[PDB]
Design a binder for these strands. Structure first.
Ligand SMILES: [Mg+2]
Ligand SMILES: [Mg+2]
Lengths: 504, 69, 150, 230
RNA sequence: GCAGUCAAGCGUUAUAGCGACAUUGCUUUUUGAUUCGAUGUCGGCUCUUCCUAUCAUACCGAAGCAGAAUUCGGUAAGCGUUGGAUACCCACUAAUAGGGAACGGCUGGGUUUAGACCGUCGUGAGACAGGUUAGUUUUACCCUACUGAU
RNA sequence: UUCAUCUAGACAGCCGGACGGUGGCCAUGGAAGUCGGAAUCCGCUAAGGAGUGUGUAACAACUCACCGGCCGAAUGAACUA
């Protein structure tokens, strides 16, 4: 093993020299600050003088008082403008290096954050067997972290109990590789799209197949999407969108088990389909285009976005976490009524869509031309921004659960972190030595997990933009990774035919 | 050549901490004109020479459309 | 302006070009060498083979590169017309592939002449010359599609 | 003339009055002509004619087989489909190479009376920081044209070949003296930089150095080929 | 070249083992951008002939070969294939093709013996990793062949 | 040498048929079997491809795959020496 150089004699002597203590002076004068919001840029309180030894929580309490929510505080974070976060106190964060004098005002930008905290995963809880071929896809249940669904190449899906780390149900309806699995956003039905061009629905509590398979695709299923709960009217179930290599997007009513629309604009293989929160579907295909369809207008193509010079491989919406989660939360409470479920899902979707004046739903598209395009298709059809910098194809792209960051996983063994509003480059996560297949966020948007071709998982801390913990243990290439809604478990799977559950 | 299990082992490995150390250090080195290189350390320089670039290379057009098409 | 580009010599496809150049070597350079000669004579024989074949490929590639118009340096009307007719991206990529092949053939010839300076017998010298010509042939075979397009 | 003037000329004027008949008789004479060429061509042209005839017949048989086959009638994820790509060594025993073959006597002096300098006729790896010894005390000569730095390594897993830099010479089977001189002949064990292959140990360490065996004769083909020892 | 893939055959009752043709990876990536150790024999001049593996000249065949010009090919050695400058250039030219009879007569560099200097090594006599300068070998009237002559 | 065809008709030739849904769907300025991409079905048959090539800007016309009429006794294919 190659090692870092040892300290020299001089360095050992300076280490033996007595250390200085970073202390806070007691006569430190008051400093003028101006509060300002990151998303809206509203200056609240004007230039007010605060003690130089002010702490993060005391500053946060002052801000909650000035905004008028002292009874109901929401924890925020503070940044300074080079954007530097306020860690422990203002003196240590800014004054101690001396970048700004005390007499000068400091413009402190406050950003709301998540109330709950997700611990990093540090160890493999278990290595679970049962699949006879390579594992292709995995997802957690949206309401609980105790139920996981995994589809593999032995023509089967599997429902795993994460509590005992033991298999619970085997789903053996299909005739070929189960390419995609998806859980209903109300957590009631599992949809599996296969290599044999079929979509099969399953009851997870009994591990059973609902009727017969949905048919109509002439090529293998590539992606699945669910109708958002907040758009679904109470007393009715969401519809299922499916895409395939034949270039069509088929919409299925599961209540009556029929096909309502078959959108057919694309000319090559459709890579992905995402059902947005404003009654639209976004489809990405190998014909270098992204199509915007309106479900309210009998499945017609509204827009064609053409800015990619090669295949589009993936796309991600800003509200994707909320749309997948539906009415559930990080506490996973089951609503009393479908009415209250619909209202809570609507509020959860609105808290991310409608902000900074008007509701927006940004889309990001990751392509084979080594780039990504950031769009706001509701307002403009030209791209908002172009993100370049990757040396190989961008295989996976993901919006952060609060919609403030974009993470792009490429085949150049790298991940890149971008701003989720205007798409400017922030940082590069390095450490995978082989191509990074896909990535996943935590619920509180501080931790990111990536799986690679190098048979490893990696957990990254976003705020420090550095590697948190490297997780080996898989014997072969890892294809799929996911993080639970409550943030308690991470699942992974690949060529080793073993489902790996990881915990703190 | 005799059969031996030493032929099939790894000869050099490097940890993630060491990779991060050398990746950060390569860039904080300040060359002096009066210092000469007496001996170079042996490192995985392909792993270590990773720089953020503002621009991406152009796409390959022959994948989507061949000369005959 | 040139305004007209009829004076471009015929572009042979990859297999035909290989036949033309390799048979030109076999015809126009002497073919009889004996293991009983001086090693200096044997080495000069095989060096001449490698150098002559490399020059033949280089002259074909140069005749291709000099004849064809420069799409970005012509009048913009002609640039747009040739872009519509021939797809400028494919045009420049094919001509650049020819240029890369020219550089690789020159490098192969130089490397194997330098190696042939240290050959100790007819067998080794012959193997080195065959390796050089085979590498040139591999480079030319990788040009099959751009040559047909051009 | 402009655009497709020969096609327009044929459309407006036709062809020569004997065109179809002459072409038809030439095609009918083709069988006799092919037989005559096969029996009359000599030397290099005859050998090439026979070679091309064999290739054409193979191609026709493959086309017939494909037609009749048509007339009768890894488990990758979604983002990887529609995309394309005992501790015994593979060479336990190799040809013995004597010192007479390995070394060339270099004569020195005005009348060539001294014969103490020796030149290595094979390819070598001299390592990092190589400086030649002064000419008065240089007995062993390793010329710069025969020094190699990189090798074509084939991985048995995934069947890929990569051009990897050479780290060291571990074992030349001919002699430990050739090992310490860095001679690269067939069957030599070398250390290679495997950083671009992305290998990770069970403990999470990144592998960047492994062993390979040389499988060819670089003095004969001008390059180093090795198979990785996994 | 190494490593693989295919499979016409070879093989056989144990889908083992060989294996032509095809084919992929490395070498070697995309926008026509931008000299690295020959250890031991080389060259002129005059003059003849031979090979064809043909550069030109003759006649043919093919090609988006309009014409002009060119490219690739067939028969073909009858006939030519240069002047300079220091293996590359400049030019002229129809063209400035490759090779053998040596490398299994005068002459310049070279084996260059004795003189001499510089460099490296050697305690030294001296030797060389080397560099430079100066340095006599002189048939024919014999036979034959060849050119002419009785 | 081993397979096949054959007087309820061998091979070669000449003549005739070679159809209907239908210009099948997408795509194109145009594209009707015959620039392309995917399906390649059904009917009527003695037989007839959602077509083997020539051809047209697209059609047309010709062709051959297949079937029949005339003719009348052997014929074809792959292997070995
Ligand atoms: Mg000839
Ligand atoms: Mg002397």
């Amino acid at each position: 093993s190659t090692l870092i150089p040892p300290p020299s004699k001089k360095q050992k002597k300076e280490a033996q020299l007595p250390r200085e203590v970073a202390i806070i002076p007691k006569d430190l004068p008051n400093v003028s600050i101006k509060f300002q919001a990151l998303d809206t840029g509203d200056n609240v309180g004007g230039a007010l003088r605060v003690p130089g030894a002010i702490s993060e929580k005391q500053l946060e309490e002052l801000l909650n008082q000035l905004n008028g929510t002292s009874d109901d505080p929401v924890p925020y974070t503070f940044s300074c403008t080079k954007t530097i976060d306020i860690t422990d106190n203002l003196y240590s964060s800014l004054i101690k290096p001396g970048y700004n004098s005390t007499e000068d005002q400091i413009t402190l930008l406050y950003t709301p954050r998540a109330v709950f905290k997700v611990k990093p995963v540090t160890r493999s809880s278990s290595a679970i067997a049962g699949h006879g071929s390579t594992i292709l896809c995995s997802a957690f249940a949206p309401h609980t972290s105790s139920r996981m669904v995994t589809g593999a190449g032995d023509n089967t899906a599997r429902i795993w109990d994460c509590d005992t780390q033991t298999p619970m149900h085997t789903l053996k309806g299909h005739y070929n590789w189960v390419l995609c699995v998806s859980w209903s956003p109300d957590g009631e039905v599992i949809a599996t799209g296969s290599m044999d061009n079929t979509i099969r629905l399953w009851d997870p509590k009994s591990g059973q197949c609902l009727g017969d398979a949905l048919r109509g695709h002439s090529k293998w299923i590539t992606s699945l999407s669910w109708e958002p709960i907040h758009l679904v009217k109470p007393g009715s179930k969401p519809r299922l969108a499916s895409s395939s290599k034949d270039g069509t997007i088929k919409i299925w009513d599961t209540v009556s088990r029929v096909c309502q629309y078959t959108m057919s604009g694309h000319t090559n293989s459709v890579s992905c389909v995402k059902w947005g929160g404003q009654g639209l579907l976004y489809s990405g295909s190998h014909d270098r285009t992204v199509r915007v369809w309106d479900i309210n207008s009998q499945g017609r193509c509204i827009n064609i976005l053409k800015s990619h010079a090669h295949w589009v491989n993936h796309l991600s919406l800003s509200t994707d976490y909320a749309l997948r989660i539906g009415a559930f939360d990080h506490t996973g409470k089951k609503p009393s009524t479908p009415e209250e479920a619909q209202k809570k899902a609507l509020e959860n979707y609105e808290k991310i869509c409608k902000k900074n004046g008007n509701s927006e739903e940004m889309m990001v598209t990751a392509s084979d031309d080594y780039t990504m395009f950031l769009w706001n298709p509701l307002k403009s059809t030209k791209p908002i921004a172009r993100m370049t910098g990757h040396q190989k194809l961008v295989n996976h792209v993901a919006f952060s659960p609060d919609g403030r960051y974009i993470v792009s996983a490429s085949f150049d063994n790298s991940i890149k972190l971008w701003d989720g509003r205007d798409g400017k480059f922030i940082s590069t996560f390095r450490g995978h030595v082989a191509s990074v297949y896909q990535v996943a966020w935590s619920s509180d948007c501080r931790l990111l997990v990536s799986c690679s071709k190098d048979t490893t998982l990696k957990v990254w801390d976003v705020r420090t933009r550095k590697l948190s913990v490297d997780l080996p243990g898989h014997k072969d290439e890892v294809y799929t990774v996911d993080w639970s809604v409550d943030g308690k478990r991470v699942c992974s799977g690949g060529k080793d035919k073993m489902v790996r559950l990881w915990t703190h | 050549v005799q059969p031996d299990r030493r032929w099939f082992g790894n000869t050099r490995v490097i940890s993630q901490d060491a990779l991060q150390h050398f990746r950060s250090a390569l860039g904080e080195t300040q060359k002096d004109t009066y210092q000469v290189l007496l001996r170079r350390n042996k490192l995985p320089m392909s792993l270590l020479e990773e720089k953020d670039a503002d621009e991406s290379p152009k796409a390959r057009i022959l994948d989507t459309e061949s000369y005959a098409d | 302006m040139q305004l007209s580009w009829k004076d471009i010599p015929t572009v042979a496809p990859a297999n035909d070009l290989l036949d033309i150049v390799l048979n030109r070597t076999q015809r126009k350079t002497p073919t009889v060498i004996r293991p009983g000669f001086k090693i200096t004579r044997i080495r000069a024989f095989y060096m001449r083979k490698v150098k002559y074949t490399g020059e033949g490929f280089v002259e074909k590639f140069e005749d291709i590169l000099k004849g064809f118009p420069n799409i970005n340096d012509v009048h913009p009307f002609h640039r747009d017309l040739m872009d519509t007719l021939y797809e400028k991206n494919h045009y420049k990529i094919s001509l650049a592939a020819i240029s890369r092949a020219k550089s690789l053939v020159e490098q192969v010839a130089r490397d194997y002449v330098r190696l042939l300076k240290f050959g100790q017998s007819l067998f080794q010298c012959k193997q080195l010359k065959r390796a050089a010509l085979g590498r040139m042939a591999t480079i030319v075979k990788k040009l099959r599609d751009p040559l047909a397009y051009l | 003339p402009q655009n497709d003037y020969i096609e327009r000329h044929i459309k407006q004027h036709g062809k020569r009055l004997d065109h179809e008949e002459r072409k038809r008789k030439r095609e009918a004479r083709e069988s006799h002509k092919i037989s005559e060429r096969a029996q009359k061509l000599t030397g290099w042209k005859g050998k090439q004619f026979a070679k091309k005839r064999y290739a054409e017949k193979v191609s026709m048989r493959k086309k017939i087989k494909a037609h009749e086959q048509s007339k009768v009638k890894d488990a990758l994820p979604t983002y990887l489909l529609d995309r394309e790509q005992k501790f015994s060594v593979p060479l336990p025993k190799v040809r013995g190479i004597s010192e007479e073959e390995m070394f060339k006597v270099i004569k020195t002096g005005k009348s060539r009376s001294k014969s103490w300098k020796r030149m290595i006729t094979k390819h070598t790896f001299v390592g990092e920081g190589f400086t030649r010894r002064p000419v008065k005390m240089e007995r062993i000569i390793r010329p710069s044209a025969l020094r190699q730095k990189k090798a074509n390594v084939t991985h048995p897993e995934l069947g890929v070949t990569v051009f990897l830099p050479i780290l060291a010479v571990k074992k030349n089977p001919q002699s430990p003296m050739y090992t310490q001189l860095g001679v690269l002949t067939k069957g030599t064990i070398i250390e290679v930089n495997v950083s671009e292959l992305g290998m990770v140990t069970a403990g999470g360490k990144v592998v960047w150095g492994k062993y390979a065996q040389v499988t060819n004769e670089p003095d004969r083909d001008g390059c180093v080929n090795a198979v990785l020892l996994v």
